[PDB]
């Protein structure tokens, strides 16, 4: 299955007219015995993975730079056997007022394994959301990691999003 995977995120900064656009890639890990329970831990710009298996070589609180301004790399194959699910998403900071993906120009994410593209998205499906999951990694019976597209919108701020981003969706 997948051995290592990365997530890169781009977005445009805000007009001189407005407070910064602060977006974060956020991931959570889930125990084999509770794939949809509480996160085992949360990974984002200000919180490293405790096991060293996830890194961010860059991150941004503004989107000022050009291209992919934030990235998170996962060495899935190096995760404890007791972790069997990972979910990664993107959250918009809400401290300058209610702000969705539709409010922020050229928001984009790419999920890849090296040179194999897994997902590219502009968050069009979740225009009204303050935060969104984009991808799920889960282990096989044989223990190999698999990817699934998991683009789903949420209405929470970044901290609340992390608590709920792994919960079982509603069937439909």
* Contact residues for Na ion, defined by CB under 5 A: 24, 45, 59-60, 63, 69, 101, 104, 107
Q: How far is the CB of 146 from Na ion (least distance, A)?
A: 27
Q: How far is the CB of 67 from Na ion (least distance, A)?
A: 7
Q: How far is the CB of 65 from Na ion (least distance, A)?
A: 5
Length of the chain: 172
CA atoms of 22 and 6, how far apart (whole Å): 20
Residue number with CB closer to Na ion (25 or 79): 25
Residue number with CB closer to Na ion (130 or 139): 130
CA atoms of 45 and 26, how far apart (whole Å): 8
Q: How far is the CB of 16 from Na ion (least distance, A)?
A: 15
Report DSSP letters for 95-153, one per residue: TTS---GGGSTT-EEEEEETTEEEEEE-SGGGTT-SEEEEEEEEE-SS--EEEEEEEEE
CA atoms of 63 and 103, how far apart (whole Å): 14
Residue number with CB closer to Na ion (106 or 142): 106
Helix, strand, or coil here: 52?
Answer: coil
Q: How far is the CB of 129 from Na ion (least distance, A)?
A: 10
Residue number with CB closer to Na ion (6 or 79): 6
Residue number with CB closer to Na ion (85 or 99): 99
Residue with smallest beta-carbon separation from Na ion: 107
Distance of CA 164 to the CA centre of its chain: 13
């Amino acid at each position: 299955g997948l051995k290592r995977v990365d997530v890169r995120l781009k977005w445009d900064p805000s007009p001189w007219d407005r407070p910064p656009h602060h977006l974060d890639i956020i991931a959570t890990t889930y125990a084999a015995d509770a794939p949809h329970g509480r996160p085992v831990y949360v990974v984002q710009f200000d919180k490293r993975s405790p096991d060293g298996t996830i890194n961010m070589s860059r991150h941004s609180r503004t989107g000022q730079g050009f291209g992919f301004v934030e990235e998170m790399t996962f060495e899935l194959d190096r995760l404890s056997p007791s972790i069997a699910r990972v979910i990664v998403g993107v959250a918009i900071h809400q401290d300058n007022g209610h702000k969705t993906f539709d409010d922020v120009s050229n928001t984009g994410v790419v999920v890849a394994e090296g040179y194999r593209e897994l997902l590219t998205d502009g968050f069009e499906r979740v225009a009204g959301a303050t935060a969104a999951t984009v991808a799920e990694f889960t282990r096989n019976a044989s223990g190999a990691w698999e990817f699934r597209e998991a683009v789903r919108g949420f209405d929470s701020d970044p901290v609340l999003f992390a608590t709920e981003m792994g919960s079982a969706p509603r069937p439909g």
